[PDB]
Design a protein around this nucleic acid. Structure first.
Ligand SMILES: [Zn+2]
Ligand SMILES: [Zn+2]
Ligand SMILES: [Zn+2]
Ligand SMILES: [Zn+2]
Ligand SMILES: [Zn+2]
Length: 143
DNA sequence: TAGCGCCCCCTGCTGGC
DNA sequence: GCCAGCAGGGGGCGCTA
């Protein structure tokens, strides 16, 4: 911990990533700003990734189908559809999932007590997931 | 420094069951 | 409906040409 942060218990080996840390967490200085919206980042790379949402530029092409992503890590995640990998394991029932959010959702829906459920206003049926309420609304009533 | 890399976060849909 | 699969837009770190 050579360059200790004067505001918290964290410390960094180079002064550069201390400046970036003090930006992300303490000073929130975002000098790299998008010229098409109010988005700004502590990092230029985050800015450029953001820019590709405006242009539709998908530079990272999947080699097994027509899919292509705006961020390298989204491609990596998409490849799990062709590979069937399931990197995340629930530490309670040990079921496996292709994404971390899916696991968190599983832990919330299967292993958390007294979870607030969603209710359909039109047929008085309890639904566990916000998105399943949306589908229920679209398929059943009128939506 | 900008540029890779990591991984997480969160959000919201599909379609088999 | 439940469920996991699956894609889009983001944050924060560790590292370094
Ligand atoms: Zn700090
Ligand atoms: Zn923008
Ligand atoms: Zn693909
Ligand atoms: Zn589980
Ligand atoms: Zn209903």
């Amino acid at each position: 911990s050579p360059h200790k942060c004067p505001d918290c218990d964290m410390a960094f080996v180079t002064s550069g990533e201390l400046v970036r840390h003090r930006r992300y967490k303490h000073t929130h200085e975002k000098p790299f700003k998008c010229s098409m919206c109010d988005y700004a980042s502590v990092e230029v790379s985050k800015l450029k990734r953001h820019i590709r949402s405006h242009t539709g530029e998908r530079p990272f092409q999947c080699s097994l189908c027509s899919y292509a992503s705006r961020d390298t890590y989204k491609l990596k995640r998409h490849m799990r559809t062709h590979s069937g990998e399931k990197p995340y394991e629930c530490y309670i029932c040990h079921a496996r999932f292709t994404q971390s959010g899916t696991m968190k959702m599983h832990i919330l829906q299967k292993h958390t007590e007294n979870v607030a459920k969603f209710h359909c206003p039109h047929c008085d049926t309890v639904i566990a997931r916000k998105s399943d309420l949306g589908v229920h609304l679209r398929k059943q009533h009128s939506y």
